[PDB]
Amino acid sequence: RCPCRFFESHVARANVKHLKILNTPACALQIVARLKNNNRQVCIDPKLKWIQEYLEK
Amino acid sequence: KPVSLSYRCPCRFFESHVARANVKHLKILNTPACALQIVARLKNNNRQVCIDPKLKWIQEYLEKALN
Structure with a gap:
């Protein structure tokens, strides 16, 4: 059961506190x-x- | 109002031994x-x-996450 069924493209780095890459x-x-x-x-x-x-360098 | 030497980084110490099967998700902060x-x-x-x-x-x- 995938929590993500929808995606948002209108997101900037500036809007995010952090990212969670689900396993x-x-x-x-x-x-x-x-x-x-x-x-x-x-x-x-x-x-x-x-x-x-x-996801940095 | 100062805000210094009070707001630590999420990580100061790290672990290099973690099995992917025991990971629900990776929280990436930058x-x-x-x-x-x-x-x-x-x-x-x-x-x-x-x-x-x-x-x-x-x-x-990370690579397989399409990004």
């Missing part, structure tokens, strides 16, 4: 963002350019 | 003051453990 292989979406200001959790588009940057 | 830090939510005890990012299985895990 759920088989699920297409496993990236959940805990958002700043409101503490809502939303699954994000894994294609967001900033993700690879955040 | 801030200017603390850099990249990974906190694993463990399956066996639901506790949070800071892990070494240089771990081998981490890269593939």
